[PDB]
Amino acid sequence: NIVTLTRFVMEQGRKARGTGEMTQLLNSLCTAVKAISTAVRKAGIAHLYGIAGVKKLDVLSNDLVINVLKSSFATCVLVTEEDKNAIIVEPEKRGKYVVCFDPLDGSSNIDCLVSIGTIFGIYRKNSTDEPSEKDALQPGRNLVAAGYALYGSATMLVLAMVNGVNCFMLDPAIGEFILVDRNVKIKKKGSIYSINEGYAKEFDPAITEYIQRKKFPPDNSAPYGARYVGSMVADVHRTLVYGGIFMYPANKKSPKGKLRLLYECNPMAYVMEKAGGLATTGKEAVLDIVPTDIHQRAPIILGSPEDVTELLEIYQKHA
Amino acid sequence: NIVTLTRFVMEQGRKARGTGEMTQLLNSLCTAVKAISTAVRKAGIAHLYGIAGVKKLDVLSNDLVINVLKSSFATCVLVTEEDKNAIIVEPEKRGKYVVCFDPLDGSSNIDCLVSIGTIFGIYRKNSTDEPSEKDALQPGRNLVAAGYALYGSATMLVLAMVNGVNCFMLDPAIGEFILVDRNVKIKKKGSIYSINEGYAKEFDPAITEYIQRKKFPPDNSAPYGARYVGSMVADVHRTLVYGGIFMYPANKKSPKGKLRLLYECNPMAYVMEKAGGLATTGKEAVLDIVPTDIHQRAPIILGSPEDVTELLEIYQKHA
Amino acid sequence: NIVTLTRFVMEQGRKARGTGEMTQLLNSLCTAVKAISTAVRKAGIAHLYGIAGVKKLDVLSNDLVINVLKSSFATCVLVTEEDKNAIIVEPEKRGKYVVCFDPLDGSSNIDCLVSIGTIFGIYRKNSTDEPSEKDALQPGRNLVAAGYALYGSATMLVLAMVNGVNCFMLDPAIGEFILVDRNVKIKKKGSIYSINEGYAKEFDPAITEYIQRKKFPPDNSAPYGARYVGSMVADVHRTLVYGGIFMYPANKKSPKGKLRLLYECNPMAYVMEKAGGLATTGKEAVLDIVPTDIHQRAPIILGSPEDVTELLEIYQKHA
Amino acid sequence: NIVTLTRFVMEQGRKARGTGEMTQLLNSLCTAVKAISTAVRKAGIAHLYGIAGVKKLDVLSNDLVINVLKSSFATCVLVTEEDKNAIIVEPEKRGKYVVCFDPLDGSSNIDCLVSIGTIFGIYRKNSTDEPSEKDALQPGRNLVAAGYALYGSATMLVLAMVNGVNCFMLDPAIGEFILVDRNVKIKKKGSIYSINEGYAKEFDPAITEYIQRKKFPPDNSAPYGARYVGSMVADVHRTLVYGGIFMYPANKKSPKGKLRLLYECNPMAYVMEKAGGLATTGKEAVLDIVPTDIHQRAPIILGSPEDVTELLEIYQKHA
Numbered sequence A, B, C, D: 001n002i003v004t005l006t007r008f009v010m011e012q013g014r015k016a017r018g019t020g021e022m023t024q025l026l027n028s029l030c031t032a033v034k035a036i037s038t039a040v041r042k043a044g045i046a047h048l049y050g051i052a053g054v055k056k057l058d059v060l061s062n063d064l065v066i067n068v069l070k071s072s073f074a075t076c077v078l079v080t081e082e083d084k085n086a087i088i089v090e091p092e093k094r095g096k097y098v099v100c101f102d103p104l105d106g107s108s109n110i111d112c113l114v115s116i117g118t119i120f121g122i123y124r125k126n127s128t129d130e131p132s133e134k135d136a137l138q139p140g141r142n143l144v145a146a147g148y149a150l151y152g153s154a155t156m157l158v159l160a161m162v163n164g165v166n167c168f169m170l171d172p173a174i175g176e177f178i179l180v181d182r183n184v185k186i187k188k189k190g191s192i193y194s195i196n197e198g199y200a201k202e203f204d205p206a207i208t209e210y211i212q213r214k215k216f217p218p219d220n221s222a223p224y225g226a227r228y229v230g231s232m233v234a235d236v237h238r239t240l241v242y243g244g245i246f247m248y249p250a251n252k253k254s255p256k257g258k259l260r261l262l263y264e265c266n267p268m269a270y271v272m273e274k275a276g277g278l279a280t281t282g283k284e285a286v287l288d289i290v291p292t293d294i295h296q297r298a299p300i301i302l303g304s305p306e307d308v309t310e311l312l313e314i315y316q317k318h319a
C-alpha cells in the first residue's frame, strides 16, 4: 500500500530523532510476529504428519520473540509470561529497552482454533545500574509503546505510541503489515459487554449490578449484546473496533484478578487510553499501578469511556 | 502427511462404489474453501491499498462456492444464505446433488477479525421432476454429507458422513487438508456453556433455569465456564473439540430462533449427531424437522449428550 | 479457475472408466510436487538459520515422491534417479503402476538458483509375477502418462497422456494447478537450438554440421538463437512452448549420452511426441528403445519436427 | 535467522550515520521485490481464470517499483527500462537518490517460465539544479549501491555496496530476506563460459578466438562447460556463485552491444567488482564509461578475473 509498518516506524523514528535503536526493536518485533503468524496458521503442518516419511506453539512463539528481540541489540531485560524470572540480555546484545510480553495469549483456545495473539509493552530502562527484574517494574504510564498482534480471521498488528493507535493488517503474500486504520479512537459508548459469566457466584456486587443493567436496562433501552471469545487479545480488539466493555474483575480464584499486569493489563490499558478509552481495576487506573512482582495479577475493566464510567459509578455507589 | 482430504474422499468414494460425482463435488468444495481462506487471511490486501498505484468478503465467498460447485457438474440445486431464491443449475452442468451452504458464517465478526467459517450440507436429489427449491426442503436426517470450514487461528475443514466425523487441517504451504483428528467423538459431558446472555430478558423459563444451574450448581460442583465467540462455526467447533453446550434458542426477534435451518442448524446437527452428541430445538430433533421455507429459522441447542439431555429434561419438567 | 488439475484428472478417470487407482496416483503426485515446490522456493528457510534459536533438497524431494507414491496404494515398483535399485512397494500398499522419476532434475543448478524440476513416467505392470525391476524395463512407447513439474519463475505441471499434453500452473495461494494451456502442440519449426557447446571437441560429425548450419545458414536466413539453461526440464519446457531443438548427444564421457533413459529421456520423448514433436537418439526413436538397465543412458535430440528431421537427415547423409 | 535484510540495512545505515533516507529507499525496494516475486510465482492466478466467476507482468513490476520508490520519499529521478524518459519525482516526494532499474529483466523468458529478475543501481544526486535526466547520467563508478533480485528456483536479493556483496534469500513464508552468503567473492578462475553462440557469424575476432579456446584448449586442459539461460540476472548470478565468464559483446544488431548501460551493465559491473571480479567492454571498464543517453547500450564481458583478463589479452593481441 501507501504505508507499510516498516515505513511507518522508520518515519516515526526519524521524526523523533531516535538513534535507530527503538526502530530496530519494532522491526524485530514485526519479524517475530510474522514467524508466529505462519506457525499459527499451520503452514508446514504436513511435515509433522509424515509427508516425507515437538515444541508446543506457545513455547515456539516464546523462542521466536526472545531470539528476535535479543538480536535487535535494543533490549536489556525481557519479561515473558512463559518464564519465571526476567531474562537479562547478554552485555554484548544489550540496548536500553525493557520488553514485557505474552508470546501467545489465549493458549487455552489454541486447540479449538479460536483467535489467539501476542501482547507487548516496551519501556526505556529507568536506572543506570545493572539491568535486573526491577527495570520491568515500572507503572504502565511509563510505556513508550505497546500493542498486540491478533491471529484471527486475518493477522493484525495494533501499535500504540504517545500520539495514538494505528492498525496494520498483515498481507502474508508479501510479509508486510499494511496501515489500514489510522489514529483509531474507540466509540464513546458501545452496545456489547464481554465477561466470563461462569464466575457469577464469585462476582462483587458492583459487577453483579452492572451485568443486570446490561440485560435489563432500567431506562428500557435495548439490552447490550454479549461476546466473550475467551482470548484477551480477541475480546480487546473487538472492544477497540466496535466499542463496548471488556471485564476480567477479581473473584474467588483471585481477588487480585486473573490477568497479568505487566504483559496483559498494562499493554491493553495503554492501547485503550491512547484510543480515548478507559482501563481501570474498578478502583484505580491500571496504568498507575506500581508493580511489585513481574507476574503480578490485576483486575481490569476496559473499553468505551461512558460504559467504563458507568461501572465506576456503580463501584463508587457501593463504596 | 499420510492422509490428505483428497485421498480420504477418493478412497471413501471407491469404497462406496460411487460413480465419482460426489467425490468431485467434495474436491470442488475443498478448492473453494482454500480460495476463501486465502482471501479471509488477506493475502494480497496490499493490492487494494495502492502498492502498484470492491466485492465484500461474504459476496466473494458466495461467488467462489457457487462457481466452484456449478463447475463440478455434480449439483442441480444450490441454497445459499446470500440468495433469496434457490439457484437452479443449468442443464449442462447438472448433477444429482443439492447443496445448502452459508459461504461466510459469522459475517458480523468479519470487521473485528474474529473467526468465521463456511457451513455446508449435501443431499441427493429426491425426485425425478425438474430440479427446484423443493429438492432442498429435505429434513437434515437425509443429509449424505455435512460440515464446515473454520477460518480461525488456523483453517480446519470438518467433514461428517454416515460413518463419522473427521477433522482436516489446511496446510496453506501446499494447499492440502491433512487428517489430524479421526472418527471424532464429543465428550459425554462438558464444562462450558455458550449462549448470548444479552437476551436474558427474552429467554424461556427452561433456558433461564439451566443457565442459573451452570452458574450456581445445586450439587455444589464447579460452575461451567462461559464462552461465546458470536460466530456459530467457532462456538460449535469448540463445542465439538472440548465438549459442553451451545445454545441459540428462541427470543423476541424470533420465537423460531435466529439460526437458519437448512445451512446453519442442519449441517451442525448432523456433525454433532455423527460425533455422538445431540441437537434439539428444545422440543424435537433438528434433523427431523421437515422444512417448508429454504430460509426457515429454528432454535438450536447442541453439544455433549449429558448436557443437552439435562436441558431437555428441564423443558420436559416445565411442560 | 474453471479447470483444476484435480478436476481434470478425475474427469479423465471417469471418462476412461478407471477404477480410481490411476486417478489417486496422479492426485498423490500433485501433492508431492506442491510439497517440493514449497521447499524449493525456500518457504521456512529462516528456521534453518536460527530465527527461533540437514537433508539436501534432492534427498528431501525423493523422500516426498516415494512416500506420497507408496501411500497412494497405486504402485508396485518405483525407479528413482537417487536409488541404485528399483524400490519394490510393500504388498499391503501395492497397486498396478510402475513409476520412473527424477525427483529433482537439474540438481547441479540448485546452488545457483536456476530452474529445476521433477520428471515422471508411469507404466502399467506388464506381467503377473512378483513385481521386480524388470517391470520398469518397458520401452517408453508403453507409457500411460508422463510429464514434469518445472520450478521456474512459476511452478508448472505438464502432463501428457494418450490424447495429448496439457499445462497446469500452480497457484501457490490455494495449492491448485490451474489449466492454462490445453492440447499443446509444438511449432513445426523453431528458431532456437539448445546444446552444451563445451563438448564441441567430442561431437560427432552430424551434430557438428548441424550446429554450423544454425550459426551460418546456407540459405542465408537468420541464424537460430542459442539457449542452454543446463537443467533438462527448463530447456525442454522452453522447447515445447517456443519450439526449436534440444540436444544431449553422445560425447567422450558417454558414447551412450548422459541423460537417463527411464526417467529423463522417455518421459520427455513422450511429452514431445504427444505434442507433435520428435525425440530420437539420432538413429532410432527414444520411445522404442527396450531398456536393459534401470539406470541406462541414451543420447537424445527432441523438439520441433522440421528441426529434428533436418538433423536426422544429416545423420542419414553421413551414414 | 540471525540476520534479516531489514536489520542489515538498518545497521549499515546507523554505522554510516545516514539520516535514514538511504535505509528507507532500500527497505522500499525490498518491499517491491517481494510484491514482484509473489506475482511472478503466480500466487492468485486462479482469480484470472474465473475461480469466482490484464497488465503484463513487466508492466506490473514497473508500477510496483515506481510506486514503492516514490513513496519512500528518498528519490528524485527514476530511470526505468520501460519508460522512454527519466521520471522526475514530484517535489513533495523528493529525496536525494537517483535510481536506475530494469523491473523485470529477462522478460522474453517470461512465457517459458525461465528465471527472470529485477536489476537496480542507486546514485546520490550530483548537482544542486532541478532534478532531470542528466542526474542519471553518472558513470557506474559513482554508484552508492546496486544489485538484483533473482526470481529463480527460489528468490534471492544480491546487494552490493562500498564494502562488498551479500546475498539474501527471500523466505516467502514470512516475507524476510535472510542473509545466507556474506562478503561474497567470485572465484579467480571458473570453468563455464556464457554467451549466445547464435551470433557466431557476427562476433569480432577476439571473441571468436576466445570461444575456440574454451572448446579446444591449446594446453589440452578440459574444455569449459557452456551455460546461457538467456536472462542476464540468471547468467550473472551463476557467474558470481560458480565463477567463469558471461559475455554480451557487440555484433551486427549493435556494435554497441545489446545490454543497457544504466540498468543492466553498470549494476552488474558494480556487483562484480565488489566481489573481486572484472567487467569490461573488451576495451575499457564498464563502470568508467561516461553515459550520454539513459537508454545507451554497451558491450559487457564480466566474471572471474583470470578469465576476463584472458579475453582482454586476446583483444589487446588483436589491437
Ligand SMILES: CCOc1cc2ncnc(Nc3cccc(-c4csc(CO)n4)c3)c2cc1OCC
Binding pocket: A038, A039, A041, A042, A043, A044, A045, A047, A048, A054, A055, A056, A057, A058, A060, C038, C039, C042, C043, C044, C045, C060
Ligand atoms: C507448534 C510447533 O510447530 C512446529 C514445530 C516444528 N518443529 C520442528 N520441525 C518442524 N517442521 C519441519 C520438519 C521437517 C521438515 C520440514 C521442512 C522440510 S522442507 C520444508 C519446506 O519449508 N519444511 C519442516 C516444525 C513445524 C511446526 O509447525 C508446522 C505448522
Ligand SMILES: CCOc1cc2ncnc(Nc3cccc(-c4csc(CO)n4)c3)c2cc1OCC
Binding pocket: B039, B041, B042, B043, B044, B045, B047, B048, B054, B055, B056, B057, B060, D038, D039, D042, D043, D044, D045, D060
Ligand atoms: C473482500 C474481497 O477481497 C478482494 C477483492 C479483490 N478484487 C479485485 N482485485 C483484488 N486484488 C488485486 C487487484 C489488482 C492486482 C492484483 C494482483 C496483481 S499481481 C497479484 C499477485 O497475486 N495480485 C490483485 C481483490 C483482492 C481482494 O482481497 C485481497 C485480500
Ligand SMILES: CCOc1cc2ncnc(Nc3cccc(-c4csc(CO)n4)c3)c2cc1OCC
Binding pocket: A038, A039, A042, A043, A044, A045, A060, C039, C041, C042, C043, C044, C045, C047, C048, C054, C055, C056, C057, C060
Ligand atoms: C533442503 C531441505 O530443506 C529443509 C529441511 C528441513 N529439515 C528440518 N526442519 C526444517 N524446518 C524447520 C525446523 C524447525 C522448525 C520449523 C518450524 C517451526 S514452526 C514452522 C512453520 O512452518 N516451521 C521448521 C527444514 C526446512 C527445510 O527447508 C526450508 C526451506
Ligand SMILES: CCOc1cc2ncnc(Nc3cccc(-c4csc(CO)n4)c3)c2cc1OCC
Binding pocket: B038, B039, B042, B043, B044, B045, B060, D038, D039, D041, D042, D043, D044, D045, D047, D048, D054, D055, D056, D057, D058, D060
Ligand atoms: C501479470 C499481471 O498479474 C496479475 C494482474 C492482476 N490484475 C488484476 N487483478 C488481479 N487479481 C485479482 C482479481 C480479482 C480478484 C482477486 C482476489 C480476490 S480475493 C483475492 C485473495 O488475495 N484475490 C485478485 C491480477 C492478478 C495478477 O497475477 C496473478 C498471479
Ligand SMILES: Nc1ncnc2c1ncn2[C@@H]1O[C@H](COP(=O)(O)O)[C@@H](O)[C@H]1O
Binding pocket: A009, A010, A012, A013, A014, A016, A017, A018, A019, A020, A021, A022, A023, A026, A096, A124, A144, A161
Ligand atoms: N521508530 C520510532 N517510533 C516512535 N518513537 C521513536 C522511534 N524511535 C525512537 N523513538 C522515540 O525516541 C526515543 C529514543 O530512541 P532511540 O535513540 O532509538 O532509543 C524513543 O524512546 C521514543 O521516545
Ligand SMILES: Nc1ncnc2c1ncn2[C@@H]1O[C@H](COP(=O)(O)O)[C@@H](O)[C@H]1O
Binding pocket: B009, B010, B012, B013, B014, B016, B017, B018, B019, B020, B021, B022, B023, B026, B096, B124, B144, B161
Ligand atoms: N467420496 C465419497 N465419500 C463418501 N460416500 C460417497 C462418495 N462418493 C460416493 N459416495 C456414496 O455413494 C453414493 C453415490 O455416489 P455418486 O455415484 O458419485 O453420486 C453417495 O451419494 C454416497 O452415499
Ligand SMILES: Nc1ncnc2c1ncn2[C@@H]1O[C@H](COP(=O)(O)O)[C@@H](O)[C@H]1O
Binding pocket: C009, C010, C012, C013, C014, C016, C017, C018, C019, C020, C021, C022, C023, C026, C096, C124, C144, C161
Ligand atoms: N485419471 C485418469 N486419466 C487418464 N486415464 C485414466 C485415468 N484413470 C484411469 N485411466 C485409464 O484407465 C486405465 C485403468 O485405470 P485404473 O483402474 O485406475 O488402473 C488407465 O491405466 C488409463 O488407461
Ligand SMILES: Nc1ncnc2c1ncn2[C@@H]1O[C@H](COP(=O)(O)O)[C@@H](O)[C@H]1O
Binding pocket: D009, D010, D012, D013, D014, D016, D017, D018, D019, D020, D021, D022, D023, D026, D096, D124, D144, D161
Ligand atoms: N542503510 C545504509 N546502508 C549503507 N550506507 C548507507 C545507508 N544509509 C546511509 N548510508 C551511507 O550514508 C550516505 C547518506 O545517507 P542518507 O542521509 O540516508 O542519504 C549514503 O549515501 C551511504 O553512503
Ligand SMILES: O=P(O)(O)OC[C@H]1O[C@](O)(CO)[C@@H](O)[C@@H]1O
Binding pocket: A105, A106, A107, A108, A196, A230, A231, A232, A233, A248, A258, A259, A264, B225
Ligand atoms: O477462562 P477465563 O477465566 O475466562 O480466562 C480467559 C482469559 O485468560 C487468558 O487466556 C489468559 O491470558 C486470556 O487470554 C483470557 O482473557
Ligand SMILES: O=P(O)(O)OC[C@H]1O[C@](O)(CO)[C@@H](O)[C@@H]1O
Binding pocket: A225, B105, B106, B107, B108, B196, B230, B231, B232, B233, B248, B258, B259, B264
Ligand atoms: O449476535 P447474536 O444474536 O448472538 O447472533 C450470533 C449468531 O449469528 C450469526 O453470526 C449469524 O448466522 C452466527 O454465526 C452466530 O451464532
Ligand SMILES: O=P(O)(O)OC[C@H]1O[C@](O)(CO)[C@@H](O)[C@@H]1O
Binding pocket: C105, C106, C107, C108, C196, C230, C231, C232, C233, C248, C258, C259, C264, D225
Ligand atoms: O552439464 P551438462 O553436461 O550440460 O549436463 C546438463 C544436464 O545434466 C542434468 O543436470 C542431469 O540430468 C540435466 O538436467 C541437464 O540437461
Ligand SMILES: O=P(O)(O)OC[C@H]1O[C@](O)(CO)[C@@H](O)[C@@H]1O
Binding pocket: C225, D105, D106, D107, D108, D196, D230, D231, D232, D233, D248, D258, D259, D264
Ligand atoms: O536473446 P539474446 O540476444 O541472447 O539477449 C538476451 C539478453 O537480453 C535480455 O533479455 C535483455 O535484458 C537479457 O536479460 C539477456 O542477457
Ligand SMILES: [Mn+2]
Binding pocket: A081, A102, A104, A105, A106, A107
Ligand atoms: Mn498466555
Ligand SMILES: [Mn+2]
Binding pocket: B081, B102, B104, B105, B106, B119, B232, B263, B264
Ligand atoms: Mn452461517
Ligand SMILES: [Mn+2]
Binding pocket: C081, C102, C104, C105, C106, C119, C232, C263, C264
Ligand atoms: Mn532429471
Ligand SMILES: [Mn+2]
Binding pocket: D081, D102, D104, D105, D106, D107
Ligand atoms: Mn527487460
